[PDB]
Design a protein around this ligand. Structure first.
Ligand SMILES: [Zn+2]
Ligand SMILES: [Zn+2]
Ligand SMILES: [Zn+2]
Ligand SMILES: [Zn+2]
Lengths: 51, 51
């Protein structure tokens, strides 16, 4: 849910910041509070926002 | 020798962003790229930036 001049394509979609990883399956960004909740909520693999 | 380490900002001390957790002992902010490694490199007690 991002649009109207976002100016930020490297941060959690909900917090909009404090995130450096994006779920490969969900194709969405998640902050440490979310990335850690997912990897703990079950079994998921996320990649770093870097190249 | 003794030095002051305070940071009112809420982001990694190195990346300066993409962080939502800080070590209580080191009193430093770390991003998902550093926090994940920190907990995997050693055992430290950190808390979420939320409150
Ligand atoms: Zn996911
Ligand atoms: Zn989030
Ligand atoms: Zn960092
Ligand atoms: Zn530490």
């Amino acid at each position: 849910g991002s649009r109207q001049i976002v100016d930020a394509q490297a941060v959690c979609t909900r917090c909009k910041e404090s995130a450096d990883f994006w779920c490969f399956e969900c194709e969405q960004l998640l902050c440490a509070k979310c990335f850690e909740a997912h990897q703990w909520f079950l079994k998921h693999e996320a990649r770093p926002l870097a190249e």
